[PDB]
């Protein structure tokens, strides 16, 4: 689990969105596993606007942060789950690192701010849903 709080928005994995998230829906994209809902309190997370390929992510299944190198956002094949059939997920970045399904939502950050959240994994790889292109999260 985990979310990004920026301005009047909450960014979560679309497959983990709650009833309140869907009743205050701003935008969702199944192909990216993202959902954004509106909040009443103001968030102070900063979103990165960069092309970094190094950062640190939080891994709840180890209660630890790990530094990683990660690929550029792209269309990558993701195996089936209870939430989606097997498909291409877009705007996804892979890194070599530990992750389990419950790790979804852990933040990946670089020196510029929040880059994305854990969304996929398996085989010693961890995949992050990018949020750096969502310029409207700031405006
Ligand atoms: C973060 C992670 N690490 C894993 C390791 C293993 C192992 N072994 C298995 C799964 C994972 C997952 C999450 C897989 N997943 C993908 C999500 C999506 N974005 O399509 C939908 C829900 C879901 O469970
Ligand atoms: Zn950066």
From Swiss-Prot:
This is Protease 2A. It catalyses: Selective cleavage of Tyr-|-Gly bond in the picornavirus polyprotein. Zn(2+) 1 binds at residues 50, 52, 110, 112. Homodimer. The active site is at residues 15, 33, 104. The chain holds residues 869 to 1007 of 2193 of the full protein. Cysteine protease that cleaves viral polyprotein and specific host proteins. It is responsible for the autocatalytic cleavage between the P1 and P2 regions, which is the first cleavage occurring in the polyprotein. Also cleaves the host translation initiation factor EIF4G1, in order to shut down the capped cellular mRNA translation. Inhibits the host nucleus-cytoplasm protein and RNA trafficking by cleaving host members of the nuclear pores. Counteracts stress granule formation probably by antagonizing its assembly or promoting its dissassembly. It comes from Coxsackievirus A16 (strain G-10). It comes from the Viruses. The lineage of its organism: Viruses, Riboviria, Orthornavirae, Pisuviricota, Pisoniviricetes.
